[PDB]
Symmetry: C3
Subunit: 210 residues, 3 copies
């Protein structure tokens, strides 16, 4: 009952964000639009109940959340890594790491016992490899970005461990509200905050070889 | 009984098209070959009955059709967008839209009630965003292409609404014949018609910077 | 019992290989690391028993093995094709073929009767198209590479036909040991053997236009 309302709020908010982002930005590759549109699909699937499995302490796990993050967060990571002027091959690497983090997180959420532990460890290893080059970047853009990695991206494995995906210390519904707050921060606030600086950065890189 | 014959015809025709396209074209990236080869796989899976679900008015839905279109139609969209000399980042955007249209169409086909409606709406929104830059292109190549978008690509959501995927006004078998006709048009006739002009266009773009 | 030990050995070995490859190579796009990390995930899923189906002569089939090869072997194929200085569009083509080979091989393994035969034929056709430009390459690098294609990549369809995936002449456990030997050869020995020559090749291509 309660969790349907959370998922409905997610559908509504990301529909508004997608419509806004498409209208506000240039009518070309709009990662902000795609990230939100994909998240709409993900929230509808969770509302539908398409793959709900038993979590810890009697909660539920919605492992398609994590699988769709493999797509939307790769777009986010493209923006972040470009913003920090990583090389093209490091951008691709970081995007691969991102997909791996999300895919193994979905496995860790769904599976049990030692499989959950094993997949959570692999996800965490790839995640350390993902954020270390972001957090240690010498780019002047590192601090604008660090707050998304530290409070947003890193909030997810913390929420995961508390949630039925992990130990089940908090309920399914409270976990879902937490994931929705983190989604708004990493997928919507991120662009309101950084869209213009990222576009200006993209123009400077285009104009200046090297 | 009848629908097995339709799917068998699809297997046979796309096997011949793939063999022809591989032989006829250069032994390099051959999108025509890949589009047909992928469609072969899709028809075998539908003949096998791998994920058949109940549609409207007592028909059947073969939602893997739509999922495989996310792969083969991205290759088609690459050809179309390149043909109209869209920028590299607009090509990628249009390819993303294409995958979204097909993925949400497969969800709309499979799911029911308000979920079918919701996913059909999201698919239609992405589809309007996909074809608007194609149909309004100033490229001299726009008219050669418009007939595929207007009669072929747009025939699919019309067939979908009539089919058990949508309202079920026509039977599963009649829908499948219609989808096969649309497949031959958008995946085979398309290349017989446009292959040479697309290759010439690709050569001119390679030779002339700007 | 016995096969759990094989899968555990795979988990252990690829974890060591991934850790070694990440440490040994440059902290940038590391295909050797990703190939091994992905294979870890695949072995954990097979140990878990996530999609086990009945094979021939009373064996078992682990069709997720083949599906994950579509990802790890595309990275390998990127390295191989680059090593032979194939053009960018031929590299993409070969990578598409690779995904098709693995995807249809997973279908052939899982399905039965004429579907197994049909999908094995399609996989074999794409595989001939994949290796013919590798085996006939005029690159001086062709011979270093030919032993991986001839003994490793081609060992898989042979093992497949013997295994419960195919005729079931050998048991599930013996097939799994054979696949693990082939994995170590094509994914680990490959890099110990060829890593330096591939990096030197990549530097020469970067430095010399044409
Ligand atoms: C915009 C979001 C729209 C959300 C609408 C949610 C309506 C559902 C109401 C509901 O479930 O409230 C009760 C909830 C569950 O209580 P529990 O004891 O877990 O059962 O109790 C709660 O609401 C607790 C959940 C609130 C958690 C917010 C955490 C914020 C943490 C900030 C950290 C920095
Ligand atoms: C990390 C790497 C991940 C990257 C890519 C992952 C994205 C795909 C994840 C989707 C999983 C969906 C699984 C699913 O729908 O569960 C089975 C479902 C049961 O549904 P039932 O209870 O019958 O109602 O029945 C079904 O199978 C539903 C029918 C298929 C619905 C498919 C929806 C696909 C949407 C793709 C959108 C593309 C986004 C761009
Ligand atoms: C090349 C294609 C090979 C197809 C072989 C198909 C054999 C199956 C025969 C069959 O089902 O015919 C009867 C069919 C069903 O009749 P219904 O009342 O839906 O049951 O009735 C029909 O055949 C009707 C289906 C024909 C629909 C063709 C639509 C063309 C529309 C052009 C629009 C512009
Ligand atoms: C939009 C975004 C889509 C882009 C990418 C989508 C492509 C993947 C869609 C495939 C879905 C197949 C699902 C399926 O096979 O259904 C479950 C099936 C039940 O089969 P049963 O009735 O036992 O016989 O049992 C199975 O799971 C069958 C075993 C697996 C068969 C996998 C075939 C994969 C083929 C990939 C080819 C790559 C094309 C290039
Ligand atoms: C490093 C690998 C770690 C593997 C650990 C495996 C332990 C399992 C022990 C086991 O199953 O041995 C018995 C096995 C099955 O015998 P079968 O009659 O198939 O039942 O019998 C066998 O071991 C036979 C399997 C050995 C096959 C090796 C094939 C090498 C071929 C080289 C070709 C060139
Ligand atoms: C050729 C083209 C292939 C290219 C891409 C293919 C890669 C995806 C293949 C994964 C298939 C996994 C299917 C699976 O887990 O089977 C159903 C499983 C049943 O598990 P049960 O017995 O409940 O325990 O229940 C489940 O669905 C488990 C829950 C989902 C686990 C998803 C793991 C995804 C890992 C992606 C990692 C990305 C690698 C980089
Ligand atoms: C929705 C938007 C974003 C940026 C989501 C990010 C998610 C993560 C960083 C999740 C990480 C995980 C870790 C590191 C390990 C356990 C499994 C998780 C997938 C929750
Ligand atoms: C097989 C070849 C092609 C070009 C297929 C194209 C399919 C579509 C354009 C389908 C579109 C859909 C729409 C717009 C909305 C409902 C769901 C559909 C997937 C049928
Ligand atoms: C794990 C690493 C590698 C390089 C795996 C390669 C696998 C193949 C070349 C498999 C080929 C198949 C063929 C050609 C036809 C039957 C199905 C297979 C997938 C086994
Ligand atoms: C303009 C360039 C955007 C690049 C988008 C890359 C596509 C990411 C797909 C990841 C699939 C899991
Ligand atoms: C500049 C565009 C880079 C696109 C990066 C692609 C990442 C692909 C990851 C695929 C993993 C499934
Ligand atoms: C059922 C008792 C009412 C629950 C009130 C808590 C809901 C507020 C959640 C808001 C999260 C932003
Ligand atoms: C020669 C360039 C061809 C580009 C092919 C792009 C690959 C599309 C994959 C889409 C996956 C759903
Ligand atoms: C010039 C090659 C452009 C390739 C476009 C890639 C599209 C990736 C879409 C991935 C969505 C799942
Ligand atoms: C069962 C009665 C015969 C059905 C004849 C209609 C089949 C012709 C379909 C051709 C579609 C191109
Ligand atoms: C440095 C360039 C590496 C290119 C990696 C391509 C991504 C392959 C994804 C294939 C998905 C099945
Ligand atoms: C130089 C990087 C080339 C990357 C090749 C992408 C191959 C995409 C195959 C997608 C099939 C699902
Ligand atoms: C159960 C009888 C012992 C089986 C011994 C064979 C195991 C050796 C396999 C090693 C493969 C490299």
């Amino acid at each position: 009952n309660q969790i349907e309302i959370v998922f409905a709020a997610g559908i509504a908010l990301f529909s508004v964000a997608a419509a806004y982002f498409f209208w506000a930005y240039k009518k070309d590759f709009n990662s902000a639009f795609l990230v939100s549109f994909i998240t709409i699909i993900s929230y509808i699937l969770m509302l539908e109940g398409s793959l709900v499995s038993a979590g810890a302490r009697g909660g539920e796990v919605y492992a398609t959340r994590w699988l769709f993050y493999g797509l939307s967060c790769s777009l986010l990571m493209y923006e972040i890594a470009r913003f920090l002027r990583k090389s093209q091959s490091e951008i691709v690497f970081l995007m691969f790491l991102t997909v791996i983090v999300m895919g193994t997180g979905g496995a860790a959420a769904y599976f049990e016992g030692w499989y959950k532990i094993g997949f959570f460890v692999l996800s965490s290893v790839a995640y350390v490899l993902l954020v270390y080059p972001l957090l240690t970047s010498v780019s002047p853009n590192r601090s604008a970005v660090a707050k998304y990695i530290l409070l947003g991206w890193t909030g997810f494995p913390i929420a995961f461990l508390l949630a039925p995906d992990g130990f089940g210390i908090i309920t399914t519904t409270t976990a879902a509200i937490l994931y929705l707050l983190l989604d708004i921060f990493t997928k919507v606030i991120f662009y309101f905050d950084l869209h213009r600086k990222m576009e200006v950065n993209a123009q400077k890189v285009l104009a200046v070889s090297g």
